[PDB]
Ligand binder design. Sequence first.
Ligand SMILES: O=C(C1CCN(c2nnc(-n3cccc3)s2)CC1)N1CCC(Cc2ccccc2)CC1
Lengths: 200, 195
Amino acid sequence: RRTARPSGDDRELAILATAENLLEDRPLADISVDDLAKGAGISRPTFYFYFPSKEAVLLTLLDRVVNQADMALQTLAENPADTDRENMWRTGINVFFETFGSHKAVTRAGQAARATSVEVAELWSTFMQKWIAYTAAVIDAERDRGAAPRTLPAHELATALNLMNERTLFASFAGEQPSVPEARVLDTLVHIWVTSIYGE
Amino acid sequence: TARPSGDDRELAILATAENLLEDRPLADISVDDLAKGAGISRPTFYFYFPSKEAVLLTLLDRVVNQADMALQTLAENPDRENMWRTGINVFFETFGSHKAVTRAGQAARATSVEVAELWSTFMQKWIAYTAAVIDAERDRGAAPRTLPAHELATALNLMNERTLFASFAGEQPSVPEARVLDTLVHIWVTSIYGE
Ligand SMILES: O=C(C1CCN(c2nnc(-n3cccc3)s2)CC1)N1CCC(Cc2ccccc2)CC1
């Protein structure tokens, strides 16, 4: 037996979408459970049949965005096209440009929660480690086929490149200064990846 | 020379703070700990600093300026790969010799507008410097004209900010600290001279 809950799942989804909307204008501290309940069309007691706190709502939101990026990247890893090397790295990076770039408010809220929440910190750290291991393995496969030279240890080169994308894409999304303009940040990272993976 | 301009108590306050941030964040440091390290009563502290946050901002002002003037010294008295290595190694060595203040300064960026503006100001200045050197290396024909120089400069300087911090904080993921400078030099040099 499997317990399908179309109605409970749909309302959970409306709470999550309500939170994501509110985060575009206000930090999580300025959002109340009543704002969440009212956005989701339920009473405030009813909210607690779906989440225990507004922090659990944000943790679920970050779960959703991080796993959407992870799954999109894994989808690329299992369906390799007949394409050039620059396009390979560009579509991989664009997974993160497009996923987090379409969820800017949740991304900003997650970064801010990284210092106060161990779950968020360990969530982000877990997925960075996996994406770095994946990058390292693609770098090594490019070395094995003779397409990239054996320079730095793959995992170290992978770590610095993925940390660059983290800092740089966030600076673009959050409109920080300094930042690369959002319309130019993909080309910028792709160039640095491709030159440093294939050059000596 | 590099001596803090105040008397011995101002030095003692700053060094006690820097020492204690080695194992505790600033919230776990009291004004009393700072005053005790300088040998003064608690109210006497406020003849030197208005708050313990002011002490951390002054310590980070010293680190950031020590970095900027070691780099401006490089600019006055000059192979391409080693030029970038010595410039990156200014930050590896400066912030690597103040890991406690660097890590406390990073945490204070979220809560202090002075700290965030301080960091953003010198990052802009350091990125402009990188961008000018890239432009001079293109005008003499040594580097290809690929990305806009200021945009390539920004990502590499943000790379270093986030990668050196991860090494110095022992984060996972991070590059081991004995290997971080070669890693960043290689990426800087391939991306600045590659087509
Ligand atoms: O991590 C990122 C993005 C994510 C979005 N960003 C964030 N900034 N703060 C955030 N935060 C804090 C708490 C919650 C979220 S997320 C900026 C960058 N990466 C990994 C590196 C790279 C991955 C890759 C691997 C293999 C092949 C191609 C590409 C592509 C980009």
